[PDB]
Amino acid sequence: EGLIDTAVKTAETGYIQRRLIKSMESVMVKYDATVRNSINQVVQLRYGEDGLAGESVEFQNLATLKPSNKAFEKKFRFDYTNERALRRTLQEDLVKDVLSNAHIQNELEREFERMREDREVLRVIFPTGDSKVVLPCNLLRMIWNAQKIFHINPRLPSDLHPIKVVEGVKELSKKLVIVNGDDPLSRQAQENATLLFN
Amino acid sequence: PGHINCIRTHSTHPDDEDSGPYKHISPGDTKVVVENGELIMGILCKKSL
Amino acid sequence: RQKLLKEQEEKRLREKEEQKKLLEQRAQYVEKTKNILMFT
Amino acid sequence: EEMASDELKEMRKNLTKEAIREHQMAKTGGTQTDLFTCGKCKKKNCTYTQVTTFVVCNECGNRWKFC
Amino acid sequence: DDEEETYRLWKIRKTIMQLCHDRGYLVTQDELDQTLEEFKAQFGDKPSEGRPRRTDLTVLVAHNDDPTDQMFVFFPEEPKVGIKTIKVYCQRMQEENITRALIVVQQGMTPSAKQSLVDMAPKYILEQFLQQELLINITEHELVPEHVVMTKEEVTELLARYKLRENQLPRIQAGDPVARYFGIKRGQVVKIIRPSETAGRYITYRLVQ
Amino acid sequence: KRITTPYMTKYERARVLGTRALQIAMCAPVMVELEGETDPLLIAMKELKARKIPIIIRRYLPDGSYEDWGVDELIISD
Amino acid sequence: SKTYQDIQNTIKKAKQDVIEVIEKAHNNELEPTPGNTLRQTFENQVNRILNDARDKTGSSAQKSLSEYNNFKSMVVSGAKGSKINISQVIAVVGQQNVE
Amino acid sequence: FLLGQSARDAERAKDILCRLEHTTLRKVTANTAIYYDPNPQSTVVAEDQEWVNVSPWLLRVELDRKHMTDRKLTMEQIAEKINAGFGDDLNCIFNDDNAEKLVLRIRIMNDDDVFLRCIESNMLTDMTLQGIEQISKVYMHLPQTDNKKKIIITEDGEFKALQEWILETDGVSLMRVLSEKDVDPVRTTSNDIVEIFTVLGIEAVRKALERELYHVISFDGSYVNYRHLALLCDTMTCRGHLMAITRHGVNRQDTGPLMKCSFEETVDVL
């Protein structure tokens, strides 16, 4: 029985593959960053709806997906009231700044609000709470490499003002572009395409 | 080569080990941990190579 | 706190806009029911 | 059915219950255990099947395999 | 049946109201999601040779921005609608400046009727829907993504942005249930928004042809 | 007003290296000091690294337009 | 030489259980499982019993091996083989299904 | 997927399954005997049901009780249907639901011998007492994996998958199924491609095709990047209609004769 099954599979799979290859032999990604066929008919405005090669993509997990409202609040809010916690994590020359300054507090509140909005989007986009998702850059591995290179020693108070993180994240979100162009439609498409990774 | 960093689990890794104590020191020498491209723990198998 | 209050009153304005849309829809339904009646 | 006698009503109820039970589908077999944590629901209840050990979530229903 | 017929009529009406609201015609938030109790209490709940009889529950709704544009929703009683019924409907419509309409036929209209329907097309747009096709609102289905009928200006803007000829965009035949639901016609682009698992959101376009 | 990506695709890099190697093998002047090697492909690779290949790629768009990039203009992937 | 005793005991138990199932089916006690006819449910029960027996035998054989064993080393390294292979080689082959 | 309270308790789901399953006279009938009983009150057979109620021949179509109970039917509706389907040309004298035997009596009032044979044959073969066509039988299986369990975000935040009754059919109607009450009109897919193209729309067909392909490619535990599946789906759903990958679907596209002849129908396309 096993041998017969093997023989028939060897006879059928070849034909299946031939038809598949002959039905999409001309589709390609033109320099306009779009997928078209020999008749120049657009099949996808971006390859794979994202415009990224399948080689440099890794499995990862979405930390802000499927948490519990309370845990999400106490894991991404950066409470700026517990000065003891701030002294433990940040340095003295930063605790006073993050306390006295109100602009920093407003900025952090806005960050948390955007985080909640992204959480809502993720919940309405990935039903069934599937944290496992595929993305280009493995941020956890990058962070680990940074730690091991610069010898972070995660026990001492670090010198990294939260505003630096916020501004850097915004600048990087600006740098990573897929749909070039300042047109309103262009920007809408850029945001949509590079939504999940953001 | 280089300074790689990665974590993997060996084939014969008892599931009820991370939860209990000895998480970071495994009697069965599992939980492959590589830092700065230097093997530290675990036994390499297909899951890691 | 004042910003919260002005947000609340803006929501009140939106509620009043809902009220006006409802009243306009009723004021056109009063005329439209006549056409519905004469149709049969 | 309302006007049917007591014995007839009892027989009809038994027949309906038997038919309802028979219409169902047999549940998938497996060794239920709480040693595996499902990543799709966070629950511990689940069932395993060895043949590669496939894991099926008990409440959440997460499906995975371990080699 | 009586109760089942009343339920079917109510579901049909709810679907029609949802459809008009989707298209853009202004409708009550009340009638948009009215339950069945008020429907019974309104008409009489005796469709079997009683008050809630077809052709009496028709509704006329005007467009949101264009109050001069309306569209009827008829309910002919003939299971096999002929040509005379549609003829009289069109004749009575001609009194008003209305142009669009919607026919709800019990069973499939005779082929001879479709010819007349298309014949009067440029002067009076009217389409047909089987009650079996109206008992459910597809646009809510999980598979069906969110459609958005685009305006000519933005269609031209899109074509000029991508330097792409509209003939090169994807196609979607008018017979598509979604197409007939939105009332789109030939030479008109529909935006599609799908949840992308690898990009969060992905927006595409389809030209009707 | 060029909208093509500012990186050199692997296809373009491969073709440029090959064509420059053929030109060198046909006794064409080099654009970099030779350290004592003879393989035309190696010389082409060195020139690519030094950004001195006298070639400009013409990327055609689906519409019909095109853009002329200079090898010494866009960033080299490898 | 003890794993053999375990395997023989398990196989005898499985044989006895299938014989009892056959007796019940013959005397009309095995009620039809939902969604299946009497023959279908009988076959399903027999197959489940046999598969359970095979799995138990294989688990015993695996737990009876020694670290120096070579089958186990190759299987755990995953180079070539699997646990079912060792189970078939030592404990018992199993059911020979067709179609 | 059941929508109403039936999603929880099987009792109120069995009726839904019965009404979605096609049931016929052959399924509920046990014996069918024709008799040439001259006088209706004569009643060659011993049955005290005709005298109370009051052509020289009749059909005594006795029905089974176990099947009739399982599908939960009544002789009132059966008689109404049998009379209406063949018009006001017969007179079905049903029996009360108290007697042990579920006898009936079909008589014709206004070749005639074979007329009864023909009518009984054509009704027994197909009558549609309760249900729709196509759907032969319906299963009722609880979900064991997340792929079919209901998911609802709890006020606390966790997903907390719920276990609800779900039906598994063996035919394809979809259109008539979604219209039935207590049937979630939002998650009841069809597992068929061409049917969805006539019910939901081209985009829905694309999505369903993607899901089916992913299911059949990941069943064996293998993994295929989603980009390729998406590209294949788009290529199959670019021209609006479902272009088959066969020679009958790719050669119809206006690609080019030199490209069609390579795949197939070399001399024909040229």
Side-chain angles (χ1 to χ4, degrees), chain A, chain B, chain C residues 1-25 27-35 37-40, chain D residues 4 19 26 29-30 39 61, chain E, chain F, chain G, chain H:
Chain A
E1 183 191 26
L3 296 166
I4 292 167
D5 296 0
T6 304
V8 296
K9 179 175 65 176
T10 54
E12 189 69 359
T13 188
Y15 188 11
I16 294 291
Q17 180 173 5
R18 169 175 172 76
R19 296 206 302 273
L20 290 172
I21 296 165
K22 294 301 299 185
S23 66
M24 301 185 294
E25 58 185 354
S26 54
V27 180
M28 62 180 298
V29 187
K30 307 290 189 179
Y31 283 93
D32 186 11
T34 175
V35 182
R36 311 194 187 187
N37 55 331
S38 60
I39 321 184
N40 287 13
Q41 299 176 352
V42 63
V43 181
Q44 298 183 353
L45 302 178
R46 304 291 157 171
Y47 172 57
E49 307 173 341
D50 189 325
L52 305 168
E55 181 175 2
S56 301
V57 297
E58 293 72 6
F59 299 90
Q60 304 179 30
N61 47 18
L62 299 174
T64 53
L65 182 64
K66 62 176 294 183
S68 69
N69 290 322
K70 187 178 286 188
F72 179 78
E73 187 172 10
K74 69 171 59 172
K75 188 170 180 182
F76 306 91
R77 183 60 178 278
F78 190 89
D79 68 327
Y80 47 87
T81 62
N82 177 8
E83 207 193 345
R84 303 182 58 80
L86 298 182
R87 263 81 68 86
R88 293 297 305 280
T89 59
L90 295 67
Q91 297 188 6
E92 77 300 351
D93 56 325
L94 284 63
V95 304
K96 60 178 63 173
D97 297 62
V98 300
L99 261 293
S100 62
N101 182 322
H103 182 58
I104 302 306
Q105 299 185 4
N106 302 282
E107 188 64 9
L108 270 46
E109 187 61 21
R110 186 179 299 92
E111 172 186 328
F112 181 84
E113 185 59 18
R114 188 186 300 95
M115 202 74 67
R116 182 201 304 280
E117 186 63 14
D118 293 3
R119 175 165 167 280
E120 290 291 357
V121 176
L122 288 181
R123 277 185 168 193
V124 300
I125 293 293
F126 295 84
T128 65
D130 179 9
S131 176
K132 191 173 174 179
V133 63
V134 190
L135 296 174
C137 295
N138 194 17
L139 303 178
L140 300 176
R141 188 202 315 157
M142 296 296 174
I143 294 167
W144 191 1
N145 298 330
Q147 288 182 101
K148 287 289 177 290
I149 293 170
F150 298 92
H151 308 166
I152 290 298
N153 182 324
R155 177 165 302 277
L156 300 176
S158 61
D159 58 333
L160 180 62
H161 199 285
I163 191 66
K164 299 292 185 178
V165 172
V166 180
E167 64 185 359
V169 172
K170 292 177 181 178
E171 291 180 7
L172 181 56
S173 305
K174 296 300 180 60
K175 284 188 182 59
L176 306 181
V177 289
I178 303 300
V179 182
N180 188 19
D182 307 340
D183 174 298
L185 180 55
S186 167
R187 291 182 297 91
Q188 177 53 214
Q190 159 60 19
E191 183 269 13
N192 296 328
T194 307
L195 176 60
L196 178 59
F197 176 88
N198 282 327
Chain B
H3 301 5
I4 302 167
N5 300 324
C6 76
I7 299 170
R8 296 295 300 187
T9 180
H10 182 57
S11 177
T12 58
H13 183 52
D15 52 356
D16 59 323
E17 182 174 16
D18 57 358
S19 304
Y22 303 154
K23 179 179 182 179
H24 295 283
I25 179 176
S26 181
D29 192 341
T30 62
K31 186 66 181 297
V32 182
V33 183
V34 184
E35 301 185 347
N36 289 319
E38 297 187 1
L39 188 58
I40 308 305
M41 295 173 52
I43 304 169
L44 308 179
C45 62
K46 63 177 286 296
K47 302 299 185 182
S48 52
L49 302 175
Chain C
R1 186 268 189 181
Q2 314 329 319
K3 302 296 146 298
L4 166 146
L5 264 292
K6 57 90 180 179
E7 280 293 356
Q8 177 50 268
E9 65 76 35
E10 181 266 331
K11 301 318 299 164
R12 296 271 61 84
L13 303 186
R14 266 57 191 174
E15 185 276 326
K16 185 62 64 177
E17 298 163 21
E18 182 278 345
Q19 296 179 243
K20 83 169 186 61
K21 282 196 302 305
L22 174 145
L23 83 84
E24 185 281 342
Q25 184 53 262
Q28 61 178 95
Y29 268 4
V30 69
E31 196 287 334
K32 287 172 161 57
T33 181
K34 303 315 303 171
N35 183 16
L37 173 59
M38 54 165 275
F39 180 81
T40 182
Chain E
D1 190 324
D2 177 87
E3 183 62 17
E4 280 60 6
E5 182 172 3
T6 306
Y7 177 90
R8 294 165 57 182
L9 291 171
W10 169 73
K11 191 67 176 61
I12 288 166
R13 184 183 181 83
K14 172 181 292 300
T15 303
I16 291 286
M17 303 263 63
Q18 292 174 346
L19 188 165
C20 294
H21 177 56
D22 295 5
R23 281 194 180 174
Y25 299 81
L26 182 61
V27 184
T28 39
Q29 179 54 217
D30 176 75
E31 296 179 351
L32 182 58
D33 59 0
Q34 69 172 343
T35 61
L36 185 141
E37 181 64 9
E38 66 282 40
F39 183 90
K40 292 198 182 312
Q42 179 176 0
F43 298 102
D45 186 72
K46 186 67 173 176
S48 59
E49 305 177 358
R51 291 290 294 96
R53 67 181 299 275
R54 309 181 68 89
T55 63
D56 312 14
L57 82 181
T58 176
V59 299
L60 184 69
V61 66
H63 193 277
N64 176 272
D65 58 6
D66 178 9
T68 58
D69 182 1
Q70 302 73 2
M71 57 183 296
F72 268 110
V73 185
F74 303 141
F75 297 87
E77 287 69 345
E78 287 63 4
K80 192 70 175 180
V81 64
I83 296 178
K84 298 295 185 298
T85 58
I86 55 176
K87 185 175 181 60
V88 58
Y89 275 115
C90 185
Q91 289 295 349
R92 274 62 182 90
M93 288 177 55
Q94 187 175 357
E95 285 65 3
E96 295 66 7
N97 63 334
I98 62 177
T99 59
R100 300 181 64 86
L102 196 166
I103 312 309
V104 185
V105 299
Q106 295 289 7
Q107 301 297 351
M109 60 178 58
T110 179
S112 63
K114 300 180 181 178
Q115 300 296 354
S116 46
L117 268 66
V118 300
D119 191 335
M120 302 306 171
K123 53 175 69 177
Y124 292 96
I125 289 74
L126 72 181
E127 47 199 6
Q128 53 77 21
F129 284 84
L130 286 62
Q131 60 176 358
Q132 185 64 302
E133 295 186 355
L134 294 177
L135 287 177
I136 62 183
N137 187 339
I138 61 183
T139 56
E140 286 62 351
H141 192 266
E142 170 56 17
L143 298 173
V144 176
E146 197 263 10
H147 292 55
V148 184
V149 180
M150 286 188 301
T151 60
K152 181 176 292 188
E153 188 284 337
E154 55 189 356
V155 172
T156 55
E157 176 51 30
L158 163 62
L159 300 169
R161 195 285 181 175
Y162 291 93
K163 304 185 181 301
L164 171 138
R165 188 68 60 84
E166 79 307 341
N167 182 91
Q168 304 180 358
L169 294 176
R171 305 289 179 86
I172 172 173
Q173 57 182 23
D176 186 312
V178 178
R180 289 192 304 97
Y181 178 89
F182 278 79
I184 62 186
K185 65 180 181 301
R186 179 180 299 273
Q188 187 174 358
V189 186
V190 186
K191 179 186 297 186
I192 303 291
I193 305 174
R194 295 194 307 274
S196 154
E197 58 183 1
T198 60
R201 177 180 304 94
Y202 176 80
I203 303 182
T204 184
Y205 307 91
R206 296 212 169 182
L207 179 144
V208 183
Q209 182 182 8
Chain F
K1 298 186 297 303
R2 302 181 297 184
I3 60 174
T4 57
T5 181
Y7 295 94
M8 180 185 296
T9 51
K10 63 177 183 294
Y11 307 99
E12 298 164 353
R13 181 173 57 86
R15 187 168 180 175
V16 174
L17 282 173
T19 292
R20 182 59 179 179
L22 184 65
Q23 293 179 5
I24 295 170
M26 290 189 183
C27 187
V30 300
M31 297 301 179
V32 64
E33 193 280 345
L34 281 62
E35 302 292 359
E37 64 288 11
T38 60
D39 186 348
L41 207 170
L42 294 182
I43 298 176
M45 193 71 178
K46 183 179 294 186
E47 280 193 344
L48 179 63
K49 288 291 181 182
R51 302 179 64 86
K52 294 293 182 62
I53 295 171
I55 301 174
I56 61 187
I57 312 175
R58 169 172 295 182
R59 299 169 179 186
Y60 294 87
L61 288 60
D63 65 4
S65 175
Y66 60 92
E67 306 180 349
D68 296 5
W69 291 82
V71 164
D72 60 357
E73 298 185 13
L74 60 146
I75 302 176
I76 60 182
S77 59
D78 189 5
Chain G
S1 68
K2 177 178 181 297
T3 312
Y4 289 151
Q5 298 302 145
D6 294 65
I7 296 160
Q8 295 297 344
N9 302 328
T10 305
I11 294 169
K12 184 171 64 177
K13 290 291 182 299
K15 286 183 182 295
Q16 182 55 222
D17 298 7
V18 295
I19 290 168
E20 294 168 355
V21 179
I22 295 167
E23 291 289 359
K24 297 170 61 178
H26 282 186
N27 301 342
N28 308 85
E29 292 71 7
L30 195 154
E31 295 295 350
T33 301
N36 294 323
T37 66
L38 185 63
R39 297 180 177 279
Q40 295 170 348
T41 177
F42 169 85
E43 295 286 352
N44 295 17
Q45 293 186 16
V46 178
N47 291 120
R48 288 191 306 92
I49 293 169
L50 293 178
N51 302 332
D52 299 359
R54 176 173 59 88
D55 297 0
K56 183 179 295 185
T57 52
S59 52
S60 49
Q62 292 294 1
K63 299 177 181 179
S64 54
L65 302 174
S66 64
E67 69 290 11
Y68 296 95
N69 173 14
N70 294 336
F71 288 86
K72 186 174 180 60
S73 69
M74 286 186 292
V75 172
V76 304
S77 76
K80 180 67 66 173
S82 52
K83 295 180 182 301
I84 188 173
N85 293 330
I86 294 177
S87 184
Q88 288 185 7
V89 166
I90 299 173
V92 60
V93 180
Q95 181 59 231
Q96 302 304 143
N97 294 279
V98 298
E99 296 184 351
Chain H
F1 296 85
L2 301 177
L3 177 61
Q5 191 274 355
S6 309
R8 275 73 66 85
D9 66 333
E11 193 286 332
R12 298 187 64 181
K14 187 67 177 67
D15 56 358
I16 305 300
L17 189 163
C18 288
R19 192 167 69 268
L20 292 172
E21 191 272 352
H22 193 176
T23 303
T24 67
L25 285 177
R26 189 177 61 273
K27 301 305 298 303
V28 296
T29 300
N31 302 323
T32 293
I34 183 175
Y35 301 78
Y36 275 71
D37 179 88
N39 188 333
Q41 67 82 10
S42 64
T43 63
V44 302
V45 302
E47 301 301 346
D48 304 355
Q49 307 176 13
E50 199 284 338
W51 296 282
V52 65
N53 184 95
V54 178
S55 176
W57 49 65
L58 55 76
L59 300 65
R60 174 181 171 187
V61 185
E62 61 81 24
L63 300 180
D64 186 335
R65 173 169 294 178
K66 62 185 290 185
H67 300 341
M68 183 169 174
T69 52
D70 298 321
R71 286 73 177 187
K72 192 178 62 174
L73 276 58
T74 178
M75 297 190 179
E76 300 294 353
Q77 62 183 146
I78 293 174
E80 290 181 1
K81 293 186 67 57
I82 199 67
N83 180 81
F86 299 89
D88 196 334
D89 307 327
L90 300 76
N91 176 10
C92 183
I93 304 301
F94 63 87
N95 179 30
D96 300 334
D97 304 333
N98 301 334
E100 196 284 336
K101 295 293 183 300
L102 289 66
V103 298
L104 304 173
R105 288 179 177 269
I106 290 66
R107 181 189 307 269
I108 185 173
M109 64 304 298
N110 59 333
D111 55 5
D112 304 337
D113 308 332
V114 300
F115 185 87
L116 296 188
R117 184 72 62 81
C118 182
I119 200 180
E120 92 80 10
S121 302
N122 65 31
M123 75 179 61
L124 188 67
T125 49
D126 51 329
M127 185 54 180
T128 310
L129 301 176
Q130 175 177 355
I132 58 182
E133 286 61 4
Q134 296 73 36
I135 304 308
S136 56
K137 66 189 299 186
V138 185
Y139 310 147
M140 179 175 172
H141 187 257
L142 296 171
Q144 300 305 139
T145 59
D146 60 353
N147 65 338
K148 300 182 182 299
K149 291 184 178 180
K150 180 177 181 61
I151 304 297
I152 184 56
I153 287 70
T154 61
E155 74 301 6
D156 59 75
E158 297 297 349
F159 284 92
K160 186 183 180 299
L162 303 177
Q163 187 174 0
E164 306 296 354
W165 289 104
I166 58 179
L167 306 185
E168 180 70 6
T169 63
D170 289 351
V172 172
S173 185
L174 184 61
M175 174 53 63
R176 304 175 55 85
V177 179
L178 301 180
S179 62
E180 290 298 338
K181 62 177 64 176
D182 304 335
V183 174
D184 185 327
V186 178
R187 295 173 59 185
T188 295
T189 183
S190 175
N191 186 24
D192 180 324
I193 308 302
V194 65
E195 186 72 3
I196 302 181
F197 182 80
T198 56
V199 174
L200 295 184
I202 183 56
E203 211 65 14
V205 179
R206 175 183 182 284
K207 184 61 177 181
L209 200 168
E210 172 180 333
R211 289 201 309 183
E212 293 290 347
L213 182 61
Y214 179 85
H215 180 54
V216 304
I217 193 66
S218 66
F219 178 78
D220 63 359
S222 63
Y223 171 81
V224 185
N225 198 342
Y226 160 75
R227 300 184 165 71
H228 311 298
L229 310 174
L231 182 62
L232 174 58
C233 291
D234 291 334
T235 50
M236 292 177 63
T237 58
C238 183
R239 297 297 86 182
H241 60 74
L242 285 299
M243 66 183 294
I245 300 299
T246 59
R247 57 168 167 274
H248 300 273
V250 300
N251 295 320
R252 305 296 77 85
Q253 183 181 12
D254 61 338
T255 63
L258 288 303
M259 184 176 179
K260 303 176 190 177
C261 71
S262 305
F263 186 23
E264 289 190 359
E265 297 180 349
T266 292
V267 64
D268 186 70
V269 301
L270 296 170

